[PDB]
Design a protein around this nucleic acid. Structure first.
Lengths: 683, 687
RNA sequence: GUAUUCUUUAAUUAUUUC
RNA sequence: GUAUUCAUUAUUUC
């Protein structure tokens, strides 16, 4: 409008937001003389809804904001969807005393509070709304009914409002019906929901899709029998389908739905999906058969769906069967099919399956692409068939395809399992000359080959090159990788770096840290950790609790470890673990305290737990220590007398202790290379 | 002697070259106790090396069965099943060789773990063709093989006889395997008879045994018989472990499960509660929880937090709050875990008031807030989008004497990311900088998203330049992901191709979000060539095209003025059997005609749309008018209007704007049309 | 301005608007 | 070496 005002507006929309108020002040008099409403509008067209906001708040604090000013911002805020801002204009009103608003605007604020769970404020506002003589509209009504619906237990107030609205001649719509039914749905008002819809009929009213889904939902968590039926034939399965997907989980039946559906594709596929995503594939395959059994001829896309849900259950045998019915019915498998048959969540016996998929994948033409081979490598990688992954890697290249980074990472996954790093290094080095530079994943997979290789070299060699941006994964992978190698420098090093970069560490790191102190020479940072893990608000684990006991055990303070064990007995959620029992027994044994140690073994059994090899092994050590070899020999009996099968270390610890005690023929009688240990000892 | 020195050589050598290295010190090897070298190489965990030598020696003819058996024990002990199936397949033994049973059974199990059953049976046949006597574990492995093939019950009954006829007595491993086999075929009756018959032999069953007998009933059948087993279980005195309740959980139904185990402890109750939780059936666990009380045992804070956590993931606010009150009313006073659990809730509607209602309890609970608690509260208020309250929580943090961390600044930017309020987002990151803090990646993602919802393209590019060069921010899948999106929302084609470039270059494997966006952006221009290449490349990737992929394709053809091809897909989606055309699908098709004309065709589509049920929207009609509004025709676009309010759908701003502009440019016959009923009637004035 | 399940470490003010 | 459901080639081995 005004050239002076256009300059002012441009000057406002260009100014940063944090400084703007100190700026608007400087132009106080300049602003007051103008039409803010016109500035707000101009600041809204230009796409700067947040600058008008600032202006409004400024003017309210000055007295130059009117209803129309506010009403303009609000309409902008709701179309833009900034409920928070709406709610704040209401909590810090830029309005002068009198001040009444347009209906549309009040209903936008009501929706904003609703959107925030401030149902109690919405109702306060609604009351204030009609005591100022504002005629609410259909949308205002529907918004308020929604407030009542999510606030809960407000059915009577809903009856009241429906009355009030009709008595003022505002007939309900579809947003009114669904809103209401979902309200009954959230309160278990099954009975009164139906009487409602069936009253909607009376007064006239065309039924709907969203309606039925709401009604559906009622009987859902609440009947889906004679009900869900109507919804169909009444008239289209859109969202209504999903409702079936959770209908099954909150209940339990396979006969009614078969008996129902019988009586009657997507619709079919929907119900099948409902079964296979909650883990009822046996239930879906039956739905599939029934479906086939009645005319219906599935296409490749229906098979890919069934195979897809069978796949998450690793039902190899029937996936191949389905693969059969396809190709022998015309339904030629597509790319999506093989990818589906190869994206199986790994189980035991996956290799031969994969092998059979590949056999039909190549006995049916289908030229394997580059990505196809990568998919086939990943598959044998899941199983762990290094042998078959690499045969695929070799067949690949030998056919002229060029391996990508996805192909190298695949192979790298494998070796990682087996901690074969000497082969990993070769992969990496190969990929570099080919031009391919390792990514983050490629590194984590290296860190894991090394750790299972006990190669600290390659570990610290990467630590260097990273300290390779250190991502939360890499730093977390490094903390672990060092713990397998039990490396305190490395672990600690990158521990604080995880904090200095604004990452929140999980119980894994904390647990891993606590123990690299317990079994080491630090026993206070440990206490720091168990105080940090808590101060952090995290819930300690048994493993955490067990690692804890090991600390006290190594600090020669065992009863305290016994306390934590006992305290676990009440935990009501924790519940010891022979490890916890073992760990405590190991400590007492380590301090010469062995009666106390078998006293906890007695509890152990009494509690109905189950002593094991390692458990007995501990005592034999602690007995051998203070040379009292008879009570020790009595133990190994117990193990075997109960068939617990001792360990050569159980024997060694006695042999080596029988040697040092000047008793040689004893070491001999009692009793491989061990006897040899006595010979090189005796003389 | 001289061996200890030679082992270290092989133990310290590049694996992919060890062959030619064993070829080197060959004659020192042939005179060395191979099996001896093997035993040594394993004593240091160098088992990959003991294999390579085996294969070497084998190729030289220097490996005997005693050696192979030695490598196999380790592999099995080191869990290397594929490697053993390899030895089976290549054969490093000379002709006429026979192996220990312990080894043979280690291979059988290895063949079993790869699904190579038909092969395991053939090896078993050989093993007993060499007059080797199988042991218990051998018989048991083979049983496990029979049980995973299917239709193998007679072979199980027959082998049971043999093994029992060789004086070999079944065990718990046997029982669980035979029962579990019957569970994998639906052999309910025989599993029972077998159990009955096995019991009657004096065999005391056990947990594992009872667990398989229960999977029978529960897998595909009944919850009443499986529950009965649960019955007979305790009656025997065998305590159901965690795996027990998992079977039931996966097998008014919660009222039953509690009636049986009634004729337990607090840990028991939690074990079954958590079972139903981890399955996804939580209303049941609640039901038990109602009983654990009205039955005696009183739950503590650990038990309650457990329950709250379950509710958390379902974000069942009101009940969570009820439960927090019953806690503090029945005596159970919350802890730092209780609160944190309460604020770790899943985003949703009305979450802001919940958090306020929780914080209201943290405060009254006279519990000093810590630096951590603030970070949580800021995060939750930031997660629901209560920008206002996050910042209030923020200033309250930095005023009680706590120091923000990066998470603290990240929470805050998360909110702004939803609002697009990048100006503040900037002002923050700098503050993060002026405090000795360096922005994370997510910090860069948030800021990125923050610029997107706004429209600030200069801050995006300012991120790309700092990402495509310096190391301040590494091109992480995430960061490149947040870029394809933030450039779409701002329609920066150039800046997406670069990202789709690097993604398909930095070793990444794009996702449907990325593909589709690329498809819609190319389609939003005439970019047919690339777009179709993207679509197929979705196919060549191995992903399933959703509706948005199909709608974007139709709009491309629309855009390319081939709207007939657009309907072929709508038809194709009509019989997709898996994908049902969407409202936006139909419109996209109609507009494509109306954009090039043939509105009588546009009517053709609308017709069936209604024929397929399908209830049209405003846009549906606003588009139909477009063609009828600007096609030397007005008597129709007026008749079409009477289908909106007369059908209570209510037109809109883009609509009428097409009526005046199109009519006031096709005059007077336009004036009377607009008179039939603000911001517009200045266009007419402008004309 | 409003409704029916998933979505809340979010493509869901995602793709259609002569 | 072998079995039951769906950081673990995790924490205890005088």
């Amino acid at each position: 409008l005004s050239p002076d005002a256009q300059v002012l507006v441009l000057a406002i929309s260009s100014h940063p937001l944090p400084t703007l108020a100190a700026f608007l002040a400087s132009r106080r008099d300049e602003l007051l003389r103008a039409d803010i409403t016109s500035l707000l509008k101009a600041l809204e067209l230009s796409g700067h809804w947040e600058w008008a906001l600032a202006l409004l708040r400024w003017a309210g604090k000055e007295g130059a904001a009117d209803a129309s000013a506010l009403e303009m911002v609000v309409r902008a805020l709701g179309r833009e969807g900034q409920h928070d801002a709406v709610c704040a204009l209401l909590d810090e009103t830029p309005l002068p005393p009198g001040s009444r608003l347009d209906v549309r605007a009040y209903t936008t604020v009501l929706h904003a509070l609703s959107r925030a769970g401030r149902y109690e404020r919405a109702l306060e506002l609604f009351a204030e709304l009609r005591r100022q003589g504002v005629a609410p509209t259909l949308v205002t009504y529907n918004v308020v009914l929604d407030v009542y619906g999510r606030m809960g237990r407000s059915w009577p107030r809903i009856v009241a409002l429906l009355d009030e609205m009709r008595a003022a001649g505002v007939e309900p719509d579809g947003f009114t019906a669904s809103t209401v039914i979902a309200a009954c749905s959230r309160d278990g008002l099954v009975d009164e929901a139906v009487a409602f819809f069936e009253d909607l009929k009376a007064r006239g009213h065309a039924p709907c899709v969203v309606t039925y889904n709401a009604l559906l939902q009622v009987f859902g968590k609440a009947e889906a029998l004679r009900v869900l039926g109507e919804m169909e034939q009444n008239g289209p399965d859109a969202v209504t389908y999903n409702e079936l997907a959770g209908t099954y989980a909150r209940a339990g039946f396979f006969e009614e739905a078969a008996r129902c559906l019988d009586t009657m594709a997507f619709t079919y596929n929907t119900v099948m999906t409902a079964y296979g995503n909650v883990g009822k594939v046996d239930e879906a395959l039956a739905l599939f058969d029934q479906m086939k059994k009645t005319g219906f001829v599935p296409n490749v896309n229906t098979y890919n769906l069934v195979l897809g849900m069978l796949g998450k259950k690793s039902r190899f045998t029937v996936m191949l069967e389905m693969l059969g019915e396809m190709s022998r019915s015309g339904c030629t498998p597509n790319r999506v099919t093989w990818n589906t048959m190869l994206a199986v969540s790994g189980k035991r016996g996956m290799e031969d399956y994969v092998t059979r998929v590949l056999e039909g994948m190549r006995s049916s033409g289908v030229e394997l692409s580059r990505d196809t081979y990568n998919t086939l490598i990943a598959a044998y990688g899941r199983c762990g068939s290094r042998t078959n992954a690499f045969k695929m890697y070799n067949e690949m290249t030998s056919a002229g395809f060029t391996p990508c980074i996805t192909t190298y990472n695949a192979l790298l996954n494998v070796l990682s399992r087996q901690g074969d790093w000497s082969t990993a290094q070769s992969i990496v080095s190969k990929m570099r000359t080919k031009g391919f530079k390792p990514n983050e994943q490629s590194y984590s997979l290296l860190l894991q080959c090394y750790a299972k290789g006990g190669n600290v070299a390659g570990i610290a060699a990467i630590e260097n090159e990273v300290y390779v941006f250190p991502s939360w994964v890499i730093l977390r992978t490094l903390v672990i990788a060092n713990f397998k190698c039990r490396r305190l420098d490395g672990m600690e090093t990158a521990f604080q770096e995880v904090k200095a970069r604004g990452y929140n560490p999980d119980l894994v790191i904390f647990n891993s840290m606590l123990s690299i102190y317990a079994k080491n020479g630090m026993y206070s940072k440990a206490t720091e950790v168990f105080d940090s893990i808590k101060r952090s608000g995290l819930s300690p684990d048994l493993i955490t609790y067990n690692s804890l006991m090991d600390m006290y055990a190594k600090c020669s303070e065992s009863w305290e470890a016994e306390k934590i064990l006992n305290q676990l007995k009440c935990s009501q959620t924790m519940k010891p673990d022979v490890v916890s029992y073992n760990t405590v027994i190991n400590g007492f044994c380590k301090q010469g305290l062995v009666k106390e140690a078998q006293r906890v073994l007695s509890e152990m059994v009494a509690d109905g737990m189950a002593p094991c090899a390692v458990t007995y092994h501990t005592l034999v050590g602690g007995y051998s220590s203070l040379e009292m070899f008879s009570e020790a020999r009595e133990v190994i009996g117990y193990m075997v007398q109960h068939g617990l099968k001792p360990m050569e270390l159980t024997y060694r610890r006695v042999v080596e202790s029988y040697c040092r005690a000047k008793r040689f023929e004893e070491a001999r009688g009692f009793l491989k290379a061990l006897e040899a240990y006595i010979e090189d000892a005796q003389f």
